[PDB]
Amino acid sequence: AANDNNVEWNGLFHDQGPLFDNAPEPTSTQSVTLKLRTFKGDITSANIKYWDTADNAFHWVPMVWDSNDPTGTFDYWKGTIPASPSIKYYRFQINDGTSTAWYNGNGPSSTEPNADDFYIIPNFKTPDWLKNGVMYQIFPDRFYNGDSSNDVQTGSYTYNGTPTEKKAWGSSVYADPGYDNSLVFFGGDLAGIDQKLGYIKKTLGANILYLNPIFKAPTNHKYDTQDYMAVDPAFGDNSTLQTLINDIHSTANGPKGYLILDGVFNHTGDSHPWFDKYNNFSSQGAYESQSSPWYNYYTFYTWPDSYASFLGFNSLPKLNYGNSGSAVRGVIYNNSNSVAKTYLNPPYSVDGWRLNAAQYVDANGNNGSDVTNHQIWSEFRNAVKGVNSNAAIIGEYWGNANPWTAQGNQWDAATNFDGFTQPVSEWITGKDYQNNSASISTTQFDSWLRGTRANYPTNVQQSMMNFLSNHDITRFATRSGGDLWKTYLALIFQMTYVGTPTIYYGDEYGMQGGADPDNRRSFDWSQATPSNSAVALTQKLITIRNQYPALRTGSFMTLITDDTNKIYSYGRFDNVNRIAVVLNNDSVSHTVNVPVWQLSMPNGSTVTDKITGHSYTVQNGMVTVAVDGHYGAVLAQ
Ligand SMILES: OC[C@H]1O[C@H](O[C@H]2[C@H](O)[C@@H](O)[C@@H](O[C@H]3[C@H](O)[C@@H](O)[C@@H](OC[C@H]4O[C@H](O[C@H]5[C@H](O)[C@@H](O)[C@H](O)O[C@@H]5CO)[C@H](O)[C@@H](O)[C@@H]4O)O[C@@H]3CO)O[C@@H]2CO)[C@H](O)[C@@H](O)[C@@H]1O
């Protein structure tokens, strides 16, 4: 490069990784020094332009040359944004004589962007254990039956007139004639999860557990809460939970663990005493009397049969949050004995909450996604972080969750359906997560990923829950048509991408399953071993991620987007390691020239493909590697 009235886009780069930002999560008194990469001697000047919410105006910070990279190929320009409590957004203006280019969260541009600027949110922090960990999601009744004495039996009880049905482990989840799909129980419990912590924390290596609802409720999914204060008898008792938590946090069965519970706060079940639609309690619930002490906890359009609920489901009456200080906000998060604080405080001390249907939480029966909804989650954060600043808050949202994360006053992250699950599914399986035909090319995949990462602050990105499948969508192995190699490819991407890799129980061995409830099959333990190829790969990838901080918090740079051969390559790097991932989404092998020079991997240096174990030497800035179809390479040094 040179001063030739032309800014070379390929040499430009910046994100909030270690090499380019010295304060990714600054407090009110910490200044932020940023570095912009360009090819060596390519430009004449660069400036940081940032919007300050403190005064609703743009501010200018001229950059100065700082240094070259070890290969002498690039220059690093530096600039510092002053310290203050205000949220700020920034982009770069890069000049080389008569040539000008812009750069922000969405990469380089000729015209000045008006969206996707990088974020600076003083005092906003997301749990570092969440950024660096691997999550394992468990649907309680379907994981492991550690205590058959608490098993729900066929006819143990009835809900809305229908008796419960017990089914042999491994059998179909579909209820037999006369029974209901939501009242089918296999026996999985908390004791079981406890006895299997070794498999989770050692055989696989995950250190974070996320459980679906475990509080008293008549159904098998239990999102129709009957009593937030009690673990459901089928799963054990509150004492069992205390022990499970202690064993999760313990290091006697593997690395220190963390527990995240599912918080169903938008609604209760219709059998909850506050509502009591079937009169299961002597007390008078809202449905029973307009004089009920909990009458105002819900919203009736025409008492008592027409009331606000989740998506119109009468079994899930929607909670009325009212105004700040209300009784509902009280029992949900403000009170010391609220659902949120009770489990965050000892004797429980869980590590976080996954907020079910978080977008709908509101007052007066409204549908959320409004000022009140955001105000509520703001108060929720103050409540949670006040008890444990290291407790995670992950909201359920299938789209762009920027509104609940970008101001640093609500969630730490969200279920990454839009920035991970969907794009990964359409690129690799040619199906959306509902198993409908929907395919995207490699260039679309890369653009989709970048655009969605840009929706969030960096710490949020690193904390997103990235799962291949979950209890609300079809199994990845089913969308892939049973081709285990597609699962291999997906796992390699998952474990090397930005965000918390999240494994939906069973996905590690290729469990299949269609739409709810077939996506909640009981776990086949004969597959919970390295003998199973997908399990062996999962364990290896988790070891790799744990071995390289660059994969968890390092920078992300696109390297190759080949639509003809379906080759996708990107690099993850920091001050210590440089890793170039090469994914082959084609059905045939391809020999790829990986441009590792972009990550500043020195010519003559060696790299090791952590997948095959083969080593290569960097030559002419490249690493030539033959990658098998529906497989990948993780070239690290
Ligand atoms: O027989 C006719 C009917 O059969 C089939 O559907 C019926 C089901 O088989 C029945 O079990 C019954 O379903 C109701 C549930 O019993 C009741 O608990 C309630 O459940 C709703 C929903 O709750 C959760 O969903 C959460 C999501 O995970 C989350 O993404 C979202 O944000 O929040 C949701 C609420 O917390 C469970 O996970 C999920 O599994 C449950 O579906 O309501 C159910 C619907 O009334 O009745 C069904 C009647 O349709 C069959 O599918 C249907 O076509 C037939 O007409």
Ligand SMILES: OC[C@H]1O[C@H](O[C@H]2[C@H](O)[C@@H](O)[C@@H](O[C@H]3[C@H](O)[C@@H](O)[C@H](O)O[C@@H]3CO)O[C@@H]2CO)[C@H](O)[C@@H](O)[C@@H]1O
């Ligand atoms: O800022 C004023 C000058 O800016 C421009 O020159 C830049 C170069 O573009 C940049 O590469 C860097 O050059 C240094 C080089 O990287 C390093 O290897 C060498 O040892 O020292 C060089 C100079 O320090 O920094 C200079 C700025 O000093 C612009 O081209 C020039 O006309 C401006 O005067």
Ligand SMILES: [Ca+2]
């Ligand atoms: Ca130039």
Ligand SMILES: [Ca+2]
């Ligand atoms: Ca049991």
Ligand SMILES: [Ca+2]
């Ligand atoms: Ca009653």
